[PDB]
Amino acid sequence: IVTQTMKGLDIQKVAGTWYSLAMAASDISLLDAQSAPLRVYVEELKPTPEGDLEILLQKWENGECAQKKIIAEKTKIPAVFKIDALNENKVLVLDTDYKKYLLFCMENSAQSLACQCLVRTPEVDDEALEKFDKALKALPMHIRLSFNPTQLEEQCHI
Amino acid sequence: IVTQTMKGLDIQKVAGTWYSLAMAASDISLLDAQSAPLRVYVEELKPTPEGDLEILLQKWENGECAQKKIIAEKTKIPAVFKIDALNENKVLVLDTDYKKYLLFCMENSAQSLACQCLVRTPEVDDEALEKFDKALKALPMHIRLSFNPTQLEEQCHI
Numbered sequence: 001i002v003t004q005t006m007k008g009l010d011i012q013k014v015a016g017t018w019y020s021l022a023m024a025a026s027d028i029s030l031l032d033a034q035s036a037p038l039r040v041y042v043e044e045l046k047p048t049p050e051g052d053l054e055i056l057l058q059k060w061e062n063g064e065c066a067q068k069k070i071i072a073e074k075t076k077i078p079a080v081f082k083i084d085a086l087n088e089n090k091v092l093v094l095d096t097d098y099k100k101y102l103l104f105c106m107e108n109s110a111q112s113l114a115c116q117c118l119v120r121t122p123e124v125d126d127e128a129l130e131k132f133d134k135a136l137k138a139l140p141m142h143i144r145l146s147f148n149p150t151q152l153e154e155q156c157h158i
Numbered sequence: 159i160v161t162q163t164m165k166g167l168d169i170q171k172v173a174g175t176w177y178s179l180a181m182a183a184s185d186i187s188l189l190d191a192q193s194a195p196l197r198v199y200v201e202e203l204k205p206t207p208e209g210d211l212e213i214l215l216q217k218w219e220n221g222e223c224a225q226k227k228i229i230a231e232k233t234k235i236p237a238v239f240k241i242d243a244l245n246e247n248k249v250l251v252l253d254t255d256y257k258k259y260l261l262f263c264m265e266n267s268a269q270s271l272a273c274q275c276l277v278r279t280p281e282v283d284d285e286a287l288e289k290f291d292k293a294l295k296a297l298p299m300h301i302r303l304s305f306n307p308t309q310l311e312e313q314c315h316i
C-alpha cells in the first residue's frame with residue numbers, strides 16, 4: 001500500500017492524451033458523486049523538461065464540468081511525484097507500456113487512496129483492466145468505477 | 159446475462175439475517191448516491207410457506223434511511239423470483255451455501271442489472287467475495303461497492 005511502482009520509468013514517454021477508463025478508491029465517498037473529491041478525469045500529461053509533470057484534467061465542481069491544471073513535482077524516485085496542496089499528496093506510477101495503458105495511484109501521505117487505469121484510446125482495453133485489477137487485489141479498495149467508450153468521449157464522462 | 163443460477167435451491171433454507179457485503183451494477187447511476195435506485199441494503203429474508211420470498215431492506219429516501227418490505231413471487235424456476243412494480247423485474251439466486259454466503263442478481267426484464275454478495279455475518283468473507291467477483295466477470299458491471307464491518311452494523315451502511 002502502495003508497494004508497486006514501475007521500474008525504469010521514462011516520464012517523458014508518458015506525454016500526450018489519456019483516458020480515465022477505470023477508477024478505484026479506499027473509501028466510497030472518494031468517488032461516489034460527480035463532485036466527489038477524487039472523481040477526476042485525466043485529459044493530458046505534460047512532463048516539464050526538468051522532470052516535473054503537469055496534469056490537465058476535468059472535475060465536476062458546482063454543477064459544471066471544470067477544467068483543471070495541476071503540477072506534480074518530481075522526487076528522488078522516478079515513479080513518485082508530489083502534489084501541493086495542504087496534505088502531502090503523492091502520485092505513484094505503478095505500471096505503463098507508454099503506448100496503450102498507464103496505472104497510477106494517488107495517496108495522502110499519510111490512510112486514503114485512489115487509483116486509475118489510463119488508456120491512450122476511447123476503447124475498453126480488457127488487458128489493461130486485468131492488470132489494473134491485479135494491482136488492486138493488493139489494496140483496500142471499496143469503490144470501483146469503469147466507463148464505456150461513449151462516456152469516454154464526453155466531458156466528465158457524462 | 160445472467161446465465162448463472164443455483165441448481166437445487168431450497169428457498170426455505172435462505173431464511174434469516176443477511177448483510178449486503180458488496181454490490182455491483184451495469185450502470186454507475188444505479189448505485190452512485192445513497193439515494194440511487196438499486197442501493198438497497200438487505201436485512202432479512204422471509205420465505206412464505208407457498209414458496210414466495212418477502213424481503214426486508216433499508217433504502218435511503220429523502221434524507222433518511224427508510225425501512226422497506228417487498229414481496230418476490232415464485233416462478234416455475236426455483237432460483238428465479240418476480241417483483242411487481244411497473245417493469246417486469248426478476249430476482250435470480252446465483253449461488254448460496256445457506257450458512258455463509260448468497261449471491262443474487264436483480265435485472266429488469268428486459269438492459270439494466272444489479273448484483274449483491276450477501277453474507278450471514280458482519281465480516282469480510284474474502285471467499286464469498288472471490289465467488290462474487292468470478293460470477294461478475296461474465297457481466298457488464300460498471301460500478302462495484304463493498305462495505306467494512308463497521309458500516310455493516312449501521313443502518314444504510316453509514
Ligand SMILES: CCCCCCCC/C=C\CCCCCCCC(=O)O
Binds near residue numbers: 045
Ligand atoms: C503519471 C500518472 C498520471 C497522474 C495523474 C494524477 C491525477 C491528478 C492527481 C490528483 C488530483 C486530485 C484531485 C485534485 C482536484 C483539484 C483540486 C480540488 O478540486 O480538490
Ligand SMILES: CCCCCCCC/C=C\CCCCCCCC(=O)O
Binds near residue numbers: 228
Ligand atoms: C434471494 C436473494 C435475496 C434477494 C433480495 C432482493 C433485494 C430486493 C430486490 C429489489 C429491490 C429493488 C429496489 C426497490 C426499492 C423499493 C422501491 C423503490 O424505492 O424504488
